[PDB]
Amino acid sequence: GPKFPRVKNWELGSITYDTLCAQSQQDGPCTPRRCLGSLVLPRPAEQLLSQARDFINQYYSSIKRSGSQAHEERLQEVEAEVASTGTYHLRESELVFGAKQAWRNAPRCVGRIQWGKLQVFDARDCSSAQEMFTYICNHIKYATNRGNLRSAITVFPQRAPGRGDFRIWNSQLVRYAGYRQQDGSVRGDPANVEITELCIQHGWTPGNGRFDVLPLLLQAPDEAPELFVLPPELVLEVPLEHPTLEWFAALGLRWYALPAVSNMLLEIGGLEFSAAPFSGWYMSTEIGTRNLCDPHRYNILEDVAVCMDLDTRTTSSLWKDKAAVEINLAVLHSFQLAKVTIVDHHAATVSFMKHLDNEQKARGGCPADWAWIVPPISGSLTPVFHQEMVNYILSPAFRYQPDPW
Template structure:
């Protein structure tokens, strides 16, 4: 099985520059040791193709620009944490975000490295006695794990969670994100001052950290990667979803909207203005972000370019259309190649079990 997947990988046109002896070398390693190692060049190409293949990403036009930080040599949780901070510093780039992937050692018979946070920067969710949540309700379980590991936040709505790392055969450990690796943006609106008074903010860098990367039969279970946000991800989902921050009623109040009836479309109007506030705020702060209309056009440019190269573009339709004004974007009015989650190389979802000696184990919902 490993050999078949490895052979398919090395047959990719992107690796045609390798000497013919490389494939034979890989086969000998598999027959002798049961596995093989990618060179840094192979690793970067594999990660780029994985991005190109991933059916849920609208930003694939930029797949060739991906940068690699190769940290496969890390052997301790402390080393992994330091590498994560380096990832954040290089990818955030003082607001001019860059596409970066950091790859740690792959899964072996002895175990695997896991980063339990869904992203390197996420906000805590504090469950209250009455069942309500202060902060992000999506992250209540990982917040409770962080607390069980000794972390204590302020109890506020935007407390940055520590990054929780689990090394093979060890318990998870929590590491605070250093200030110089964190960039956040306060949310304001150029025409609605009340939105700034809500005290909203969001982090600049969407560094996904709980997905696996599979290249040529090798599973990299810790491979955080990041690009930049589409404004609607923040304004129309993270801050607006009823199971997240649920701020649309507050935004509507700032706008003086009638919220007694859905027919006033107060949710729609608040959603647009909040997303506009996000775009405005990020640009005011000098942080790269893209609006959903531009992202849609870029994706269709990518689809056209891939077609000219003779490659399909597996796409999950619901993931490349924005959560607001979808029918006003060009991605809405067409079909795509069916999503192929078995295509490799690719990024893959991984079950995340949050466990520690204090709390036992609970299955997380962040995927």
């Protein structure tokens, strides 16, 4: 057949061909000799202009004016601006389209059926760390919406030739502290040991609980970052209980409502937005399987298994599997009871299958990272497990970027 990657769904026996991958302008880490698909993080002048043109072309297509006079005039404005200044600036509607396209383009995101529905707060006028803080509080307020979560991104000023970057130092707007103990263990979240100790070095007076919310470390151009405590009433949390295991509530477990990534770079048309925090709502397995059960995170599997009276001395009891299920169930139940938006891994992957279909017709493919899309418990019970996926980088994109310190 066709000269494009053939893509098979083994459950349904159906076939598609990804033609969108031809649009990829950027190489990933794989070659004919070895697949590096599983690596988590594998290792301007005219350069700007050609990314800018590509982006402007994408914009005019999406509003159906390719080749139009408005299109050619915008192209000219952009080269003119790059010609005099070395850089250029997005119209408001170009930013909104680009931020949605970045999300639509994210191969690791299973919640992309939602991509068309994103509130884009334009904060390209921000000029201080105090002001970043107001913008961020406003984002959290809008996004949380007392539990009826709404997807959102707030975009701060782009990287500028020889000026410092806007950066949020924290990896998420909400994080729990990880306190290194004298015995070498960690109280709270071990994922956050470094950012915790940075908060302290910067004058935060540390708590000592398992679920202490971190302050934000916010850097405005060419300044040391400044510390800002989130008002407790802005951070919605959900205490965790199980629908039938009455003792589960006694564990004093909890998680926050709003997953908001704050340390990624949004690239649109060669422009780099180094601070552009975005948020959605949780898929339950991120909480109940990874955050609570990873051995290098809260690691609560054994404690829960002991409460359920399972045989933890032998793998073949499946004590780990049975505890994980209940922890995941408690997450779903507690969020549901609290009326905070959450999606379970079945409903999420089913909707991602629908997204794959929508995108097949719309664009002729969808870049997708199978290892991240398939949930971390019950993989083959979800339809995505059986679906081949082609992974490639399209721009606009969310990118990892080196920590500012």
